[PDB]
Design a protein around this ligand. Structure first.
Ligand SMILES: CCCCCCCCCCCCCCCCCC(=O)OC[C@H](COP(=O)([O-])OCC(O)COP(=O)([O-])OC[C@@H](COC(=O)CCCCCCCCCCCCCCCCC)OC(=O)CCCCCCCCCCCCCCCCC)OC(=O)CCCCCCCCCCCCCCCCC
Ligand code: BCL
Ligand code: BCL
Ligand SMILES: CC[C@H]1c2cc3[nH]c4c(c3C)C(=O)[C@H](C(=O)OC)c4c3nc(cc4[nH]c(cc(n2)[C@@H]1C)c(C(C)=O)c4C)[C@@H](C)[C@@H]3CCC(=O)OC/C=C(\C)CCC[C@@H](C)CCC[C@H](C)CCCC(C)C
Ligand SMILES: CC[C@H]1c2cc3[nH]c4c(c3C)C(=O)[C@H](C(=O)OC)c4c3nc(cc4[nH]c(cc(n2)[C@@H]1C)c(C(C)=O)c4C)[C@@H](C)[C@@H]3CCC(=O)OC/C=C(\C)CCC[C@H](C)CCC[C@H](C)CCCC(C)C
Ligand SMILES: COC1=C(OC)C(=O)C(C/C=C(\C)CC/C=C(\C)CC/C=C(\C)CC/C=C(\C)CC/C=C(\C)CC/C=C(\C)CC/C=C(\C)CC/C=C(\C)CC/C=C(\C)CCC=C(C)C)=C(C)C1=O
Ligand SMILES: COC1=C(OC)C(=O)C(C/C=C(\C)CC/C=C(\C)CC/C=C(\C)CC/C=C(\C)CC/C=C(\C)CC/C=C(\C)CC/C=C(\C)CC/C=C(\C)CC/C=C(\C)CCC=C(C)C)=C(C)C1=O
Ligand SMILES: COC(C)(C)C(=O)C/C=C(\C)CC/C=C(\C)CC/C=C(\C)CCCC/C(C)=C/CC[C@H](C)CC/C=C(\C)CCC=C(C)C
Ligand SMILES: CCCCCCCCCCCC[N+](C)(C)[O-]
Ligand SMILES: CCCCCCCCCCCC[N+](C)(C)[O-]
Ligand SMILES: CCCCCCCCCCCC[N+](C)(C)[O-]
Ligand SMILES: CCCCCCCCCCCC[N+](C)(C)[O-]
Ligand SMILES: [Fe+3]
Lengths: 240, 281, 298
């Protein structure tokens, strides 16, 4: 009957749909590889989808996926076993090297632009008409690392203009240079800003930005990467 | 075996239990100590379930059903064929679930991300524990739990419901449904919003998050934002499930009568209780 | 986290202009510091336009046409009105009138008026979702997603009442009454738990919660790498997306991309009322009792 028809029909629809869904999520990181970088033998039942090309705003070109994948940076890791499936140990300092939970991607060395073509993110000093409207204004508060030692002071807030959001704090270190700290990895207390991931001694290692009034996708990744990695790698310095 | 960008992430560490012992992968999958735990609990449980199936004398999945002990057994142990098997199976499920959560924690650490996923999952686990542990204890027999079978479980739902009248009147049930409907609505929108920006009109450039923000302000006069709709989503789902537990944990324990009748409180407020006319006067 | 530790404010954003008629936009509204701790603090502006007004006017007419009926039931007494608010009900015409538009007002006519108002209200608002998107050069995903919802509503109070031969088969406007109608609709058709569309529909509802839980917690888990900025991560994969994909690959064996995850999303939610609509449509037109049907499969 009709009902039987409809339901049998639907289970068929649903199956090609999953198939669709699945092949679309195969536009990145595929095809698969072996730990040595050579293409893996068994890529699953699903074919790579036919490429699609994205037209990027602000004359920043196009992006076609799937496409040629490459890390575009050295990886300081060495195998710890003779068969597949085991960890790869950092061969240096994971933090400095940017492997592990400290990994960063070779995104573009251009800042993200808003709908109009201006830099999406800005130090608040250069963002005409922006003020802390609620909560504790961090600016001026010392910054404490997981080792409970003071590392610097907030000397500005880097804001997201289109969305009026605090993205990073700009901290000034003992030598007078500054670093950005992701907003999402700091605890704002009433008399200090506490950073659990990094011990005071690692703040200097936080990668620097080439221009003082801009951050690029590459530098966001290298920073967030680094600060995140502290959680696993600063661990010996963290007390509480 | 690895995604084109996976290797730099596959470093040692992050394990909660047992150091480097189980710190490794099997194909795409991460094992970890709890990798093993869940496997063991999952193996055992499925076994017991098959064992129930022979005692039942059917291999047909639409028929197989593992029932809790009958009320006469209260919160004591029961013979295998008479409810023990379900009790173990329930122990094993719990073991599986919790372990699966703790593995999520272990993966979280290795990758250096927050613990929001394991945390959210714990709500699912807590709803399940409400229906097979918290409510039966409080009620006083394993027998109030739902049976493990594809349709028999739908039956428990239907019977348990109709016991208190039309269950629609359970007030926390009303609230819980609101979150389920609202969440779906919001998942519908979020998905649609991002896709429409990423997949514009033919030949146009990828839209901006700003366009998205604008599209909504134009539509209903407001836009929550990228970090917002994601907090929102998390909130509606967790909430839906939170109220779902609540509506059950109260049912049969502190309220055992017809749910519709509980509304008489409102209608019988002394200031309008006796005023004639309307529906109730 | 779930709340911002610090809020920041700037000049009110008037938005992208693309092909939008800027004459039809209102002015910015107040800022809420309350909304600010969760999401954006900025209220307005909103786009009015012809369809917005028609929609918005029919919308109120519907609501009010029901409202006067409730008062007429309450004996115009504000006390009763409050006491009995969820008990009042605007019911469709009796089965006697069939698909007739001639039912007396106290006997079903008022229901038709209200519905007519809702019909126009909803469709105009649909056209509104479409146009608003067109005027910004965006995909029409929102209008199509919306159409799914519309499907179930169309079926409940319009398509099914018409295929059954009478408006009496439609849903009454009322809080407790539309609950009862639902509960009763299942009883009559032999328990909707045997309607496999109903069962499918529940799977996608449950799933929507499962997914929006998964997606939300994930994006929050990697917002420490600017995860929420999904369009740029689609255009240039950050470590946020990799960590996102890898957390899930390592857990359950496969994974999404940032554009990908949102396709999972729109389809999981859209299938709820899509399947739903179908389950209800066959209910009572082709299948009288889902248990019996379950017995045969036919
Ligand atoms: C009876 C039911 C009737 C009830 C009415 C309710 C209808 C509600 C449907 C809502 C659909 C939501 C879809 C969301 C979506 O993608 O919208 C954007 C999508 C693109 O939007 P756009 O702005 O035009 O383009 C922007 C970009 O250029 C392009 O942007 P893009 O890349 O995002 O869009 C590409 C998109 C294009 O999307 C579509 O083309 C939509 C397809 C609509 C299908 C409708 C489902 C009907 C259910 C039937 C169930 C059977 C029961 C009987 O790709 C897909 O999503 C492909 C879907 C894959 C379907 C798999 C089919 C398998 C067939 C069986 C094969 C054998 C299997 C082997 C075994 O919209 C549409 O294409 C419109 C569809 C409208 C049709 C409505 C039906 C009329 C009646
Ligand atoms: C929480 C609310 C009620 C209840 C009310 C209902 C109602 C009402 C319905 C279901 C439906 C289903 N229920 Mg139930 N269900 C409950 C508790 C459970 C439990 C549990 C351990 O707590 C589980 C595992 C299930 C599982 C299921 C599926 C068989 C089915 C589709 C659900 C779905 O899409 O979810 C979304 C999740 C996903 C898409 C992720 C993938 C889920 C897959 C499908 C899991 C299948 C597991 C199953 C085959 C058993 C495996 C166990 C062993 C390892 C073999 N229910 C409680 C008692 N359930 C629907 C149905 O059609 O089945 C008859 C239906 O109509
Ligand atoms: C006793 C009750 C019966 C039963 C009878 C029914 C009936 C009858 C129906 C459902 C339906 C549904 N049931 Mg059932 N159901 C039962 C038990 C259950 C159980 C359970 C036991 O755990 C569950 C989980 C469900 C779950 C569900 C949903 C999956 C499904 C509706 C999805 C939806 O989101 O629609 C919500 C979305 C809409 C209604 C879309 C409407 C969109 C419109 C356009 C909104 C306009 C708003 C208006 C203009 C005003 C504007 C708002 C203001 C500005 C604020 N049922 C039992 C067996 N169920 C529906 C279904 O699809 O069944 C197959 C349905 O018709
Ligand atoms: C795919 C399935 C899900 C879905 C999707 C969906 N719904 C949608 C969309 C989509 C994709 C839209 O684009 C569209 C939308 O614009 O949302 C922002 C819509 C929408 N879904 C809505 C509601 C809705 N969707 C529902 C369900 C669902 N929608 C599904 C679960 C439900 C239910 C019953 O679960 C409801 C109630 C609307 C918010 C919106 C469609 C708006 C519309 O059509 O308006 C027409 C008429 C008016 C303008 C009426 C206004 C009259 C009011 C002023 C009266 C009430 C006054 C009241 C006392 C006010 C106070 C409220 C307080 C909280 C402050
Ligand atoms: C809290 C909000 C919602 C939510 C969230 C949620 N679910 C989650 C997560 C999150 C955040 C995960 O991270 C985790 C996941 O990895 O998803 C891919 C999970 C998950 N949610 C799942 C299912 C699921 N979630 C559901 C619900 C929900 N999940 C909510 C609505 C439902 C239902 C019925 O609504 C189901 C069916 C899994 C796909 C996955 C967890 C997988 C897992 O625990 O693996 C460990 C266990 C096994 C491999 C099998 C164990 C076998 C048992 C020992 C025996 C079988 C016993 C069982 C009781 C029989 C039941 C029979 C039925 C017919 C009744
Ligand atoms: C790229 O990103 C995106 C954005 O940015 C650019 C966006 O803007 C948007 C746009 C999104 C929006 C404008 C937000 C839309 C808003 C919603 C979908 C709904 C929000 C609603 C709620 C939080 C609440 C819903 C209310 C419910 C469920 C029922 C009412 C009840 C209660 C609150 C609880 C009542 C209870 C009590 C007192 C307890 C009683 C106790 C007992 C009975 C016991 C999207 C999608 C997006 O994707
Ligand atoms: C933006 O970012 C995001 C991503 O990517 C960038 C993502 O991918 C995802 C994840 C989401 C998807 C890929 C979309 C599709 C997902 C769903 C519809 C959810 C439903 C899921 C399932 C049905 C799969 C359930 C599968 C499970 C639990 C695993 C299957 C497992 C096995 C067969 C073996 C289980 C393992 C065992 C026994 C123990 C461990 C293993 C050993 C061998 C020991 C999200 C949410 C996301 O937000
Ligand atoms: C404070 O008092 C005042 C008066 C100021 C108020 O405004 C108060 C107002 C309230 C008391 C209002 C209360 C309103 C509710 C209780 C409403 C509840 C509504 C629901 C629960 C609706 C549920 C389901 C509705 C459904 C499925 C409707 C479907 C409608 C249609 C598909 C429309 C079909 C079209 C029809 C039959 C006519 C078509 C005719 C043509 C010519 C095309
Ligand atoms: C996660 C636990 C879920 C409960 C599983 C069933 C436990 C039953 C315990 C009864 C054992 C005996 N008794 C009555 C002497 O306590
Ligand atoms: C978006 C893809 C995920 C879809 C989930 C498919 C599994 C649902 C199984 C429901 C069982 C249903 N049925 C028809 C017997 O009632
Ligand atoms: C509705 C069906 C739900 C069950 C689907 C479970 C699939 C688990 C994922 C297996 C992916 C496998 N792998 C890693 C070998 O490629
Ligand atoms: C109901 C949800 C079911 C999910 C569908 C299962 C998809 C499995 C995809 C496995 C992909 C295998 N691969 C390529 C990663 O090795
Ligand atoms: Fe998202």
């Amino acid at each position: 009957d009709l009902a039987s028809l409809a339901i049998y029909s639907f289970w068929i629809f649903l199956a090609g749909l999953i198939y669709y869904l699945q092949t679309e999520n195969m536009r990145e990181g595929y095809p698969l590889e072996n730990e040595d970088g050579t293409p893996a033998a068994n890529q699953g039942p699903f074919p790579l989808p036919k490429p699609k090309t994205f037209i990027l705003p602000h004359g920043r070109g196009t992006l076609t996926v799937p496409g040629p994948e490459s890390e575009d940076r050295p990886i300081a890791l060495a195998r710890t076993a003779v068969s597949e499936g085991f960890p790869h140990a950092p061969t240096g300092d994971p933090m400095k090297d940017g492997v592990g939970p400290a990994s960063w991607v070779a995104r573009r060395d251009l800042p993200e632009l808003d709908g109009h073509g201006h830099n999406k993110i800005k130090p608040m000093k250069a963002a005409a008409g922006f003020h802390v409207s609620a909560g504790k204004n961090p600016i001026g508060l010392p910054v404490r690392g997981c080792d409970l030692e003071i590392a610097g002071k907030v000397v500005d807030i880097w804001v997201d203009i289109p969305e009026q959001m605090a993205r990073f704090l700009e901290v000034e270190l003992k030598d007078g240079s500054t670093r950005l700290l992701p907003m999402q990895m700091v605890k704002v207390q009433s008399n200090r800003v506490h950073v659990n991931a990094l011990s005071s001694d690692l703040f200097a290692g936080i990668p620097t930005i080439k221009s003082p009034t801009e951050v690029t996708l590459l530098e966001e990744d290298k920073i967030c990467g680094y600060v995140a990695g502290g959680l696993m790698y600063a661990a010996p310095k963290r007390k509480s | 075996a690895l995604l084109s960008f996976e290797r730099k992430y596959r470093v040692p560490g992050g394990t909660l239990v047992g150091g480097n012992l189980f710190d490794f992968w099997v194909g795409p999958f991460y094992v970890g100590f709890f990798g093993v735990a869940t496997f063991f609990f999952a193996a055992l449980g499925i076994i017991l379930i098959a064992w129930s199936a022979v005692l039942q004398g059917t291999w047909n999945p639409q028929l197989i059903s593992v029932y809790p002990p009958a009320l006469e057994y209260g919160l004591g142990g029961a013979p295998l064929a008479k409810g023990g098997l379900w009790q173990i199976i329930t122990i094993c499920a719990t073991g599986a679930f919790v372990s699966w959560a703790l593995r999520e924690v272990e993966i979280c650490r290795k990758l250096g991300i927050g613990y929001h996923i394991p945390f959210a999952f714990a709500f699912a686990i807590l709803a399940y524990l409400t229906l097979v542990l918290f409510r039966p204890v409080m009620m006083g027999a394993w027998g109030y739990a739902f049976p493990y079978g594809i349709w028999t479980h739908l039956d428990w739902v239907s019977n348990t419901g109709y016991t208190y009248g039309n269950f629609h009147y359970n007030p926390a049930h009303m609230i819980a449904i609101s979150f389920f409907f609202t969440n779906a609505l919001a998942l519908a929108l979020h998905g649609a919003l991002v896709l429409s920006a990423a997949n514009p009109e033919k030949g146009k450039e990828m839209r901006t998050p700003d366009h998205a923000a604008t599209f909504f302000r134009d539509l209903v006069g407001y836009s929550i934002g990228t970090l917002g709709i994601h907090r929102l989503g998390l909130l509606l789902s967790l909430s839906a499930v939170f109220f779902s537990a609540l509506c059950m944990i109260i049912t049969g324990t502190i309220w055992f009568d017809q749910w519709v009748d509980w509304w008489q409180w409102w209608v019988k407020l002394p200031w309008w209780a006796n005023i004639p006319g309307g529906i109730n006067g | 986290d779930i709340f911002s530790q610090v809020q920041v404010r700037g000049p009110a954003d008037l938005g992208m202009t693309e092909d939008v008629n800027l004459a039809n936009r209102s002015g910015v509204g107040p800022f809420s510091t309350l909304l600010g701790w969760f999401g954006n603090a900025q209220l307005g502006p909103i786009y009015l336009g012809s369809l917005g007004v028609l929609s918005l006017f029919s919308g109120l007419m519907w609501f009010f046409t029901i409202g006067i009926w409730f008062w007429y039931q309450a004996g115009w007494n504000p006390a009763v009105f409050l006491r009995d608010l969820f008990f009042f009900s605007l019911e469709p015409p009796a089965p006697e009138y069939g698909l007739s538009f001639a039912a007396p007002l106290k006997e079903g006519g008022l229901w038709l008026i209200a519905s007519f108002f809702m019909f126009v209200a909803v469709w105009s608002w649909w056209g509104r979702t479409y146009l608003r998107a067109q005027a910004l050069g965006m995909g029409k995903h929102t209008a199509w997603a919306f159409l799914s919802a519309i499907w179930l509503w169309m079926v409940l109070g319009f398509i099914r009442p018409i295929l059954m031969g009478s408006w009496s088969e439609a849903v009454p406007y009322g809080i407790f009454s539309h609950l009862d109608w639902t509960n009763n609709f299942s009883l009559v058709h032999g328990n909707l738990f045997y309607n496999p569309f109903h069962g499918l529909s529940i799977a996608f509802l449950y799933g929507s919660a499962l997914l929006f839980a998964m997606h939300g917690a994930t994006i929050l888990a990697v917002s420490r790498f600017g995860g929420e900025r999904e369009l740029e991560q689609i255009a240039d994969r950050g470590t946020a997306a990799e960590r996102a994909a890898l957390f899930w690959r390592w857990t359950m064996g496969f994974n999404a991309t940032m554009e990908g995850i949102h396709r999972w999303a729109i389809w999981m939610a859209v299938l709820v009322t899509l399947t739903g609509g179908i389950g209800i449509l066959l209910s009572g037109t082709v299948v009288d009792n889902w248990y019996v049907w379950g017995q045969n499969h036919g």
